[PDB]
Amino acid sequence: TQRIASHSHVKGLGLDESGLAKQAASGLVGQENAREACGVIVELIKSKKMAGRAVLLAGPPGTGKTALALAIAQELGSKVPFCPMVGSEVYSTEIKKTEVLMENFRRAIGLRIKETKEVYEGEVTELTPCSHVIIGLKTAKGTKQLKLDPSIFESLQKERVEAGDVIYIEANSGAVKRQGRCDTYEEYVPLPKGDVHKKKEIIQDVTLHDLDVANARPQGGQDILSMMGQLMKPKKTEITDKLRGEINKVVNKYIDQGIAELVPGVLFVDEVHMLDIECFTYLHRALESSIAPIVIFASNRGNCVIRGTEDITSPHGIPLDLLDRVMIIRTMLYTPQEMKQIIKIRAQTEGINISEEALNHLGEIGTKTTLRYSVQLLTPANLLAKINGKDSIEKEHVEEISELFYDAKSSAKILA
Amino acid sequence: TQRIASHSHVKGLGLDESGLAKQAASGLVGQENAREACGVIVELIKSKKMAGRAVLLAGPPGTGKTALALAIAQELGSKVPFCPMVGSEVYSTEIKKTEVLMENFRRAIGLRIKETKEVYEGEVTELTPCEISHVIIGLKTAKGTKQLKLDPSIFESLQKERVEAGDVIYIEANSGAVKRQGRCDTYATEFDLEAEEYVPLPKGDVHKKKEIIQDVTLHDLDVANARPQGGQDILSMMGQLMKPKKTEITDKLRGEINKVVNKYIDQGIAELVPGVLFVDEVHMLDIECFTYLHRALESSIAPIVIFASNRGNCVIRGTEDITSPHGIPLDLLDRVMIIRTMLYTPQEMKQIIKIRAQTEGINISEEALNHLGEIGTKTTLRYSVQLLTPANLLAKINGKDSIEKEHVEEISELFYDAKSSAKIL
Amino acid sequence: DVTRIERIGAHSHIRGLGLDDALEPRQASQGMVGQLAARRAAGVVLEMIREGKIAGRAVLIAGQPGTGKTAIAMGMAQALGPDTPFTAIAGSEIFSLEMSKTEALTQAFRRSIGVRIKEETEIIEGEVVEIQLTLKTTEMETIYDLGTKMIESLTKITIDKATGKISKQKRKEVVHTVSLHEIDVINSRTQGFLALFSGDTGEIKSEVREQINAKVAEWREEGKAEIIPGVLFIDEVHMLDIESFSFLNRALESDMAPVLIMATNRGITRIRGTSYQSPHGIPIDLLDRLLIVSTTPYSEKDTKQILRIRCEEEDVEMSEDAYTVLTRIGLETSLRYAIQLITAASLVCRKRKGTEVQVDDIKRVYSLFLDESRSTQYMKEYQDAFLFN
Amino acid sequence: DVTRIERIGAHSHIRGLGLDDALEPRQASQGMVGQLAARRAAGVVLEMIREGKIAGRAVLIAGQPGTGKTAIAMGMAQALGPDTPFTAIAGSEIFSLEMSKTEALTQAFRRSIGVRIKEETEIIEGEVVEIQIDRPSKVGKLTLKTTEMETIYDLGTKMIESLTKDKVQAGDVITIDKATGKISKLGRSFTRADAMGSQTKFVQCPDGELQKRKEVVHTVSLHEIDVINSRTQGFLALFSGDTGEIKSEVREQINAKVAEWREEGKAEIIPGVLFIDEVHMLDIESFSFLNRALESDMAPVLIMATNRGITRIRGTSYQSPHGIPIDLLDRLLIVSTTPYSEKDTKQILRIRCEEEDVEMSEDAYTVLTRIGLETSLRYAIQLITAASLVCRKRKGTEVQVDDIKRVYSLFLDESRSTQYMKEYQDAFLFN
Amino acid sequence: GEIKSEVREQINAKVAEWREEGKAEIIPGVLFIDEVHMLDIESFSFLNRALESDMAPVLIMATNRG
Amino acid sequence: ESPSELMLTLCRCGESLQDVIDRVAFVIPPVVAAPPSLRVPRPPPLYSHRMRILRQGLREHAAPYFQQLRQTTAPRLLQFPELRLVQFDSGKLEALAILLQKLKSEGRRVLILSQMILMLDILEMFLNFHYLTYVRI
Amino acid sequence: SMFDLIGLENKITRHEAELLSKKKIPRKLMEEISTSAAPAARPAAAKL
């Protein structure tokens, strides 16, 4: 039932096993060379050996740069962190652009923690303390009585447990939760594995940024004065580099211990041309870092003036010294046949039945105006067809929707 | 006595019954066309059914645009909210200029809400708490004694005020406000010297319910609900310690308050008195502010807005090269009705000078009045009316009770106008 | 009459798009006249919004000033109804000291997507005055056990059967539609729901937004919630920056993106924040993602019909000669100027003790109040007196 | 096998500054080849930093892009080693909404001066055997136990309150600070770990003396002291970064107190290096501040790198040699980097391939060296890994010239992308 | 920071009320802006209308510009 | 340590700066509202427990300073007509003030005869203004 | 929690941490402890 976006048809890069690009596969048509480059950098990301490597997708608007980045994300899976970004997002009223960039670098490196989580559940508190706490737990399948610390007792009082109120208590932390007060004696636990002693292997994916923000201020309402930290507005701060180094050291410790796995991901900076000279200059050193992710830039700019310079023109709006450290992937214009293929792919993705002559006329419209405009006429034309009792888009519907809506060039001509 | 300001002489538009402007009346002379248009706008504000209507007062400086706006305010009376504003006030360090404009729009809409006020006042005969859901408090007036079960909030406010017994207190149930206004009069004779003030015991009922009309604006409700000050819970108390910054009140709060006000209007407990927002020096607003005014004037809730500008082909601020007629974008000029103010003839200037002399309590001879009118023709109207007070001061120094021509000449020589000063520059 | 908070604004007469079931626009209906092509385009866009299957579709309403672009937007809002989110902002409102332009646009986008959640509560209670608890009702009489102290306050009504929530005769069901912005403001702080009113939300983090998107997708899969996609209307979109437009580019590519309606009344002009000239003050890359609906200037009879609709909205009766004079004025100066002349002439007639607006009333109001062209001419005649020419 | 947070970066193969004890740069040592004169200069500056005598000496590394300035800076940092502060920032990092550029530069300077503070504590540690009835003004006994001793302590009122507030229990290891009477519980007894488990931690009994003198050396920076003293809970700013313009008076007081400690032998000042990469991104205000911040007795050695030609200084219309005002250029010594010959580029590529763990044929090395000379060094470095991946996809062990050509066609350099753009420039936005 | 306008209106009204009821007496002072040319156009525009109030002092300005 | 002082005045060259505040502190908000409440049917247990824990902990932390925390943060919802307006509203009371002060200094006692009970109430207020003890018949 | 570095500031010092690392109950002794019986040989007070 989920909604169809602009890139909902991009399932992957559509490469064969030798790395070559199928003409049309997984929603992508054409751009075979750019797709093969994206495949090799997908292999680079999966190798997880290189840090701070930059790729620039350069080409006119509508040539599939963002589609290729999303295809890379699909080829990596949700296992690998994909952080999407726009160059306009660096301008924040709270932190400096450098901090925003550093944070987005932080969250493109993922951490996977393996824990064997043990817990004790049941109808519980059939006993409370028979120096020690003794609690009996019964859960259909059986009953166990166990000995707890006095500190667990103080936490239990804090939770106001009573005899007959199902609870969580975890061996790995001593944290306690009373899940309910089933009025049998308001929830009682199921019985697939309804044992009292429950343990299973857990994996949680966390980004380095999550660890940084967790360590940026106290953990909230637990502490005497961190309670008043909950009444603050959650301002974002310039997490110090020392905190980053220390978090890196502890994460490395636990990677060595084998309970954490480092999954470095992709930072995708769309509209990289909107960064100013300060941001690019910082990106130099950020990419020099051995703890940096793989960065993908996309630019449609021809010879734009670099933001923050007022005079200096560089190829993609990107300073020359940054272009010297990035690999360039060139996206090209689409032939009318590839445009027809893409229009058909979008129509299929949106559940739209289109006649052959309608598809050819829409391809002609796209060759006249642009691919995006033709792709956009599909849903309104389908709505018109449904209004007139049809389930297929016919040439009349596309003609009428073209007459109702304009492209950039037609509107510009009207404006001139 | 009251201080005389630059507009103290304007008491209205000076229009007769049919709306035609008397040549001189209510402290205004000339500008008959503009005064008649302003009378039409006064009728528009009194009609009360049109929202988001904007008028622009256009004319060179000195022509009385602000005077006409304040004349409109006088015509409406103190009942109708007249919010004066300058274009330079939008540039706030705390909130976006759009928020400032919206706040000024909201405080030009006024509410008269009839509220029942529940008052407990009397001498505290006893104060017995019950675990802490209760406080049993006995209150004594001339009428009699009553003991009441009050909330923990009122008890704990009573502890804040430190009322023990024999103390005269005033409790407002609605707000949970307790006032310890002193100890009872019967305990004055206890001691020769005691460190408190004694007040006579209340003479009315212990429990009094009173209907009062409260004058508030929509902005008052917005600010009260965006910075809550009622309620005694600890979370809100610790939020009261924050610096009271102005916040960008969301459209949701304003919609909710609109719903509440509509309910009040239906219930008959409130009446809406939409007023007028006066933005003087509207040319100071930048392009963003004007483009927001585009939307703010389409709202069905907007007040009547009056703009005044003296600029001729100024660049629109924020645009850096776009010249629009009054420093105002053309798209906004399409939404306003322009009232033009014309320059004054020598005779009208002389009349204005005489009116200002009368308001400042200055006797000026005919020769002095003619000389000052000649000066104002040469310099400006504003310059001439400014000479009056220094000239009267010199006349008092000379020991005369009127301004003669020599005093005007002396003050003219001592001070300069912009044109003479520019000449010497 | 009693003055309510909602009074006669510019677009009060518009009750919706006057559209047939085939979406064909009626000449005059629901307070909208003319703009047949633009109204038809708005109808098909409205069907797209109602269907709510395609995410992040952007429509631009372009035309000369006073051609009814904002009127078409308000008609779309009235047709859409109060149950689907319609967020209206001006391009100026994203320039905030509390948050970045990117954050303001993100919030506006998340104020336009609504999650609908229906809950089953438990309510049976009724006519009881006794104290322990037994209940009696015209058709019911019951006893309930209790083992907690909440009854003290309850003494001095109805309760929840499940958790025992106390508050002053069957289960009953409640529907709450909550926007994504509400969800992430409520969950940004301990009392973050206050920021929905004070505006002190301050750049909700991307982490919580991602988590809330994931949870909303989970709720959609599990059937607990359904997404009600709305429409974000940005009036005067030419006030946006190049940075704001570039953000809008990729903000529209989320599956949680609303339908975007933009209005602009300028030709090829400078994009704010740049020295570049683009057709609508909008960069061509964003115009690439837009369907553009153009509004035609109104004819004489369309103008007269609009004046009639506005007159009956304002409850002012005019003579036919007054209608022709006012239509000539509107065609000569502007439609807005004539719309305002309507109210001013009604006031002038009222002072006259008249009942119907005559040509003399319109002449008097025309004399009193000036249009831009006449004021500009009188200004040119007094050019030196005005400041900073 | 296992991935750490640190992996193959641009400069990960620079293990140090490859120069003799005579400061003569070896042709190829410690992962750094070529740039002989600049490496010798870096060795001289490194010796200056190690001696720590002269305050606020500024060095500029200038040269064309790709000539090794950041490589030389990282080599200096690697030769310097830890425990001597080497602060690396970009010129962009000083433009913050938190604080002024002057304040940011001041913090960067205070972060490059390290302080080693030593103190004697004289604590008591032991496993508690008994705490008996204090009911009387309360008086009680505490029995502490090491593996070699146990003693009984008579508790005053304050110590009794501290012990009852920490809920000190029989069979846990505490440490008592005699000066402060501060009780720190660090673990539970070794007679159980015997059915427990919680936030608690288990420790075995102390051995030796109950009362122990102890020297602890604390390493901090001047910035850390500044932010600790900035406000009551200011140490939290070391984490959040919410420092906000530390007062000058606090900094003067801290400088004086540090000088006192150094005279007393309590503190040891380790001056370090502040590295500002891309110093051309600084304002003229920032350069003006640097002029005077260097003239302090507590100023570190400042190293800055810039590839600019003769550019206008930021915030001004003035053309200056390195984008840096000429008054600041007089205050520093400029290290210039000569471009790389074919041999130097080949050696750099060989070292990079060693870092990547990729094996390349000699023909491939010739072709990649020629590609780097034509295009740029960094592009060749990136082609290294790209061709390694293409070779692996081909199921080959050695990268051939064919793979390099394949990745060359797949990935463009700046010049070829600029050309393809230029022939299509009407399709690209804004020129 | 940015005392509310309504608070100031309340202060003005109560001060006038105090004056009528014999409690308060208003002492109008002098505001001296030295180097008034350092004000920008917005500040001058505000000064224009800040001088129209009855609670406005006498304003002395000094400037050597021409 | 650091220095500090209280000899600092504000504009008067005088008293203890709480009398000054009391003298000039009179504004009341036109509207006072309790903070908006989140109306959720059956709020989740975790959220309610967290909120309860936070409220409980914040109290018992401000408990030592609760009286101070309340003197601050307590808005002025009421402003009463000050006691001096009596004796200013009436010239009779203005003259009676002088008469009674002279009579007090001279040692004489006074009995005030008025027909109106309500004016007797006003006289009670006026006598307390002058710290004059009385009995009402 | 092992990545909670800010919380540890309220708790311990680095000398205490080094102490703890040197003094953490070794694994072998833990099983020795959990096997052996209680050594309740307290000689009781003497007051000599």
Ligand SMILES: Nc1ncnc2c1ncn2[C@@H]1O[C@H](COP(=O)(O)OP(=O)(O)OP(O)(O)=S)[C@@H](O)[C@H]1O
């Ligand atoms: N090769 C392709 N095959 C299939 N669909 C494509 C391809 N390239 C682009 N599209 C789709 O066509 C539309 C326009 O392409 P986008 O990817 O949005 O633009 P882009 O090229 O990625 O970024 P720009 O416009 O160059 S800044 C989107 O819906 C894409 O998913």
Ligand SMILES: Nc1ncnc2c1ncn2[C@@H]1O[C@H](COP(=O)(O)OP(=O)(O)OP(O)(O)=S)[C@@H](O)[C@H]1O
């Ligand atoms: N027609 C009038 N009758 C009486 N007083 C007037 C008239 N026109 C102007 N004044 C006054 O003369 C003085 C100068 O006019 P102001 O209205 O204060 O300034 P202004 O010229 O209206 O401001 P603007 O916006 O530049 S036109 C004030 O004391 C006004 O009250």
Ligand SMILES: Nc1ncnc2c1ncn2[C@@H]1O[C@H](COP(=O)(O)OP(=O)(O)OP(O)(O)=S)[C@@H](O)[C@H]1O
């Ligand atoms: N969609 C449109 N179709 C046709 N004409 C248009 C359109 N939009 C703007 N125009 C023309 O543009 C003129 C001015 O538009 P405005 O929005 O008022 O200012 P502008 O277009 O930005 O022009 P400037 O001087 O460059 S700021 C109008 O009078 C129209 O003639």
Ligand SMILES: Nc1ncnc2c1ncn2[C@@H]1O[C@H](COP(=O)(O)OP(=O)(O)OP(O)(O)=S)[C@@H](O)[C@H]1O
């Ligand atoms: N001996 C060397 N000298 C210089 N660069 C080297 C050397 N060995 C390897 N490299 C690499 O060559 C590349 C050139 O980058 P660097 O010059 O060191 O850094 P930089 O900050 O870009 O300074 P530039 O490019 O001269 S402005 C980096 O990837 C280095 O790791």
